[model samples]
Target chain A: SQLRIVLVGKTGAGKSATGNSILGRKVFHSTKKCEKRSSSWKETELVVVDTPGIFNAETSKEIIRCILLTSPGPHALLLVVPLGRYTEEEHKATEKILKMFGERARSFMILIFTRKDDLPEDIQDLMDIFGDRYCALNNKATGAEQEAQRAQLLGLIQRVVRENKEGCY
Target chain B: SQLRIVLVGKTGAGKSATGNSILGRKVFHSTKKCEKRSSSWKETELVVVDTPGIFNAETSKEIIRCILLTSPGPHALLLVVPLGRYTEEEHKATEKILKMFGERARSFMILIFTRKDDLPEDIQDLMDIFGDRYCALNNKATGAEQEAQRAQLLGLIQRVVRENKEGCY
Candidate 1:
C-alpha cells in the first residue's frame, strides 16, 4: 500500500514549503487550495494531504473535513510550527488545534520545524528544551543536505508505523 | 521572559513521559487532560503545554485551542512522533500536517521520537530517513545514557535560540 501523510499547522508555519522540501520540488503554492500532493523516494511512493490553515474554530472544522477525504485515512500527522518567537495568533491557532484534535490524535503526530537555514548550532539544546516531540526542517535546503533531511523524515514515518502497528487512531 | 514549549503528539508518542524525563521527575501525568506544566532545569524555568491526542478532525480544533492558553505564547512546538514503524495512517497524518502549517513552519518545528528500547540498530538508517529534523526520546532511560540524549535535545533548543538571535522561539 502507498504511504499516506497529513500535514497540519497554522499559516506561515511552512506547511507548503515543507511539502516542496519533501518532494524536492515545489508542488504547493500556499496561494492555491491545499489538496493531495505526492513524492517518490528509494522504494516508496509518498502521497501527502495538505489542508487549509486552521484560522478559527470554524476553519478547524474545514481542516478536519478535508482530511476524511483521504482514502484509507493517514499514516501520520505532521503538525508544522515555525522557529523563532511565537505570536498571539499562533498561540490561538494551537489552542484551536487542541480543541479540534483532542486526545485521540497524539501518537499519530510528529512535530516538523522550519529552519530555512544551514545546519544550526545547539540543535541539541532545542532537543532538550522541547523534550522528544519535535523535528526541524529547512525548506531552503537543497542537494544532499535536503535529501538527507527528507530521508530522515521518511525514517520518522517508518518509526511511527512500527509504534502503532495496528493503525492510526 | 521564560522559554515556553508546547508538546504536541499522539498519546503513546510519550509527551508526558518525555516531560518526566526532562524534569527528571514525575511532574506531568501521561493520562491527564492537556495542561501547561512547568519545570526548572540548568538555571532556566521551562514551561510545557501538553495537549490531548488528536484522534479525528473533530478533535483538532479543541486541541490547538487549549495549547494557546499558555502565557506569553510558546517558544517552541515539540511534535511527538514515536520510535517505531511508519503506518499508512501516520503517513496520511504527516501529509495533512504539511497543508495545515504551511511552509513557514520548517524553522520552528521539531520531531521528537520516543523509544522504550535500546538504541536503534541502524542509527544511520533513521538519520537518512528523517533528515536533520528529528531527535529521540527514551523515557525508559536514566543516568548517563539518558542525560546524554537530554543534553543533545537541550543543545538543539539553544541552537535555535542563537539562530533566531533573541531566544525563545
Candidate 2:
C-alpha cells in the first residue's frame, strides 16, 4: 500500500522546504502567507499532504478544512521538524493529526526532520550523544557531514516496518 | 493589544491541556485528545481557540475553514509540545503550519513547551556543560527543573517578540 502522511505544525517550521526534500522537487512555493502543498516522491513512493499554517479562530475553520479535505485518507502522517528537538514532539503532533483523522491516529505516523546539516556535529557524534532523541525523528541534514546521519534517518522507515509487525504503516 | 492565539498541534500535542494551563481553566475538555475550546481571560484578554486535535482530512479542513471564517487574525500562534520531547520533526511540523499561514507566519508564532516539570537533572547539567545544547529540547526539560530556566525560557519568548518587531511584510 502507498504510504500517505498528513503533515502538520505551526507556521515557518520549514514544512515546504522539507516537503520539497521529500519529493526532490519544488512542488510548492513558500511565500509570506499560509499555503498548502501536496507532493509525492517517485523513488520512495511517499505521498505527503501539506497544509497552510495558521493561528486564531477567525481563520481556523478554513485552515482545518483545508488540511482535512485533502487527506486522501493517508495510511500515515509525517510530522516534519528541525534537528535537536525531540523525536517526541512528533508523537504529540502525530496524535493531533490522528485525532483529526479520528481513531487509530496513533499507529500510523512518522517524524521527518530536515536541515540535518544545521546540526552542531556529524551524525555519528549526534547519534552517540542524543541516542533515542535522534532516532525518533530521523534527523537528516544536507552536506557531506550529514551523509551518515541521513542514512541513519532512513533506517527509521525500515524500523517502522519491522516494528509494525502487522505489515504496512 | 489582545493576543488571539490558536492552540494547534497534532491531537495529543496537549493543546487542550496547554489551553487549560494557560487560561487556568478547564473550559476545553481535555482527554488524551482535545479538539476546539474557546476561552478568554480578562486582564490580558488572552483568547485561545483550541480545535480538535487531529491530523486528518475532514477535521483539519474544518479547522482551516473555521480560521478563515471567524478569524481573530491571530496575533500569535503557539505550537504546544509536552516538555517531555522537542524534535526537529516538531520543527517540520512548525514549518508546515507556518507555510500554510505564510511568511507572515513567523511574525507571531511561538513554540511553547508543556510539562516543564518533567525532566532529569542531567538534562540541566548538560545545559551547563553544553551551553545552549541544554536549552535545546531535552535540555529544555532539564532547564525546566529550575525556576531560573523558566525565566530563561520567558526571556526567549521576549526575544521572539523583539525580533519580530517589524511585524509581517
Candidate 3:
C-alpha cells in the first residue's frame, strides 16, 4: 500500500517475482500456462498487474486504458525490461513505452535491474561498471544472453530518470 | 533482387557511417533532428535500407511492417548498435525486431559492431577479463527487458534454424 506501482516489464523479467518479493508471497503467477504462474495482481495501494502476452503500442494502450480505468494515475509505472538482445531492440522498447505513456510514463517509470551478479570483474567496476556496461551490453550477442541482462533493465530506468527531470516518483 | 538491410543503433552509434559503408552512395540524411532516417540504395544483389530510429516495440512493429510491405521480409537485419550498448540496449533492440517479425526476423541478422575502432579489444579478451567467465544475462537481470529479449530471441532463432536447418533467403 506504499507505492501505487504498476509493474510493466517483459513476461518473466521478475514481474511476478518482484511482486512476490515485495508482497513476500509467491501468491500470483505470470499470465497463462503460468497458471502454475499467476495471471496478474492488483492491490488497493500498490497495484501490481502483470501483462498477458508481449505488449506493444496497440495492446499497451489498451492495458493503459484498463490500468487507468481501474487504478488511479499510477504513482509510478515500472517498466521491467532485462538486458540481452541487441541495442536496437532495447531502444525500441524504451522508445515505444515512453512515447505511448507520455509525461506520466516518464515520471512513473522505475527501470528495475534484475540480475546484477552476472557482470565479469573487468566489466564489474561497481562505480561506473553498470552504467558503462549498461551502455555496451545492449549491442552484442553470444554471452549477451547470460551476461549483460542487468544493464538492459538499468538503461530503461535511467531513461525514466533522465526524462523525469522533475524528481523521484 | 537483394537484401534490404536496415541500419539501426543508438543516437551517436555511427548508424550513418554504416549506411554509407554499405550503400556506397550518398543515400541517408543523418542529423540531430530525428534519429530514424531511411534511404534505399540498389545493388546487384542486395539493397541496403538504412534508417535512423527503432527503439520501441510499436515503432518497431510499424517499421517491420513497412519494411516487409515495401520490401520482402528482411533478408538480413544489419544491427548497427555500438559496442557500448551492445549487451544492453542493442540486444533488446535486436530481440525486439525478431519478436516483432516472429519467424521472419532472424533469417539473416549478423551483429555488426559499429566503431570497431572503439573495441579494438577482441571479444575473447573481454571474456577473459571477466572474473568468472561463466555468466548468464538471464540469471542476472531482475527484470525482463533484457533477458526476455534474448531468451525469446534464442528460442526463436534456434527454432527457426532447426526448422529450416540453416540457409539464407
Cα lDDT, model 2, residue B119: 49
- Cα lDDT tens digits for candidate 1, A1-169: 3566778777888888887876667888753345787777666677777767544556566644554344324666777777763455765776566556555456566778786473333334334433455678888777898889988877877677557522421
- Candidate 1 residues lying further than 4 Å off, grouped into runs, are A1-169, B55-61, B116-130, B165-169
True contacts kept of each: 0.06, 0.09, 0.02
Higher-TM-score candidate of 2 and 3: 2
TM-score of 1: 0.45
Tell me the alpha-carbon RMSD of every candidate: 16.9, 21.4, 22.6
Tell me each candidate's TM-score: 0.45, 0.36, 0.31
TM-score of chain A of each: 0.80, 0.53, 0.51
Our model 2 lands, by Cα RMSD against the true structure, at 21.4
**Candidate 2 residue A9 C-alpha distance from true site, Å:** 31
Of 1 and 2, the candidate ahead on lDDT is: 1
Q: Per-residue lDDT tens digits of candidate 2, residues A12-88? A: 54566655554445675633433444433334445556665532543555554454433323343455555554354
Ranking by TM-score: 1, 2, 3
Predicted complex 2: DockQ:
0.05
Question: In CAPRI terms, where does candidate 2 land?
Answer: incorrect
Candidate 2 scores an iRMS of 18.0
Report the number of the highest-DockQ candidate: 2
Instruction: Arrange candidates, best lDDT first.
Output: 1, 2, 3
Query: For residues B1-169, could you state the per-residue lDDT of candidate 1 as single tens digits?
Result: 3456667665666888877765567778765467767677766776677767553444665654554354223455676666674455644555455455544444556677887474453334435534666777778877898888778877776555445322210
